[PDB]
Design a protein around this ligand. Sequence first.
Ligand code: GDP
Ligand code: MG
Ligand code: ZN
Lengths: 34, 206
Amino acid sequence: GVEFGESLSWQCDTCLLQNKVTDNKCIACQAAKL
Amino acid sequence: SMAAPQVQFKLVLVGDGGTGKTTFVKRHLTGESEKKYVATLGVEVHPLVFHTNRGPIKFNVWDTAGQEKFGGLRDGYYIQAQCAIIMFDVTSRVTYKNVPNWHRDLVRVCENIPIVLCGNKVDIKDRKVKAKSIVFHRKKNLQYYDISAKSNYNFEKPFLWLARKLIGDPNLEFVAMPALAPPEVVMDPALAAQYEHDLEVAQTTA
Ligand SMILES: Nc1nc2c(ncn2[C@@H]2O[C@H](COP(=O)(O)OP(=O)(O)O)[C@@H](O)[C@H]2O)c(=O)[nH]1
Ligand SMILES: [Mg+2]
Ligand SMILES: [Zn+2]
């Protein structure tokens, strides 16, 4: 199959959720992007 | 803060207290050494990498800190989950009776995400919830596996099924098993064969 590296947001450093760039706050754990 | 592209999924691991959720997620050694504690939610997020024939995939598994013993989990626990494991204990019928409640709570927040149902502690000889009784998954497009966290029995199976569903590749494979904590108990080979047969029979019988 095709490698995900070819085939394929910011990541919260507290809970690892991938968030949309419009959000400056993690929608799960509320950790700020900054 | 923003962490410093990789396929990764938020996986919520739910089920009654005492069913083995923590013991199960902890079998994956790197997921335990690299786990993150989330103070605001009382969660430990374990990043579990599996190496597939198309590259690595990480299930970021959300393990509770026991709060399920006292009520439902809060919305932030579930939010943006992409898949789930519902666990029960095959020596405790009540934990299986509660499976529909966990499923309802999941779907209420996350809708139709892929879910695997896991019956844990199958290493224990005096098993109460047997294959013929395990029917909830047939009703709801859920996949079922017997597991034994303490013996690593079938550890990879829920993750492989979820990966195939999430990626949309029925032929996806794991090229190697993850490095797992050595079994603490023996999964009796004959018992495993019986349970696999019992599941086969339940699935093919007319
Ligand atoms: N024999 C056996 N005991 C298990 C297994 N998984 C968990 N246990 C035990 O069940 C108890 C609850 O496990 P725990 O991981 O804390 O469950 P949780 O409350 O669902 O996180 C503990 O005493 C575990 O050692 C298993 O696969 N086999
Ligand atoms: Mg636990
Ligand atoms: Zn977060």
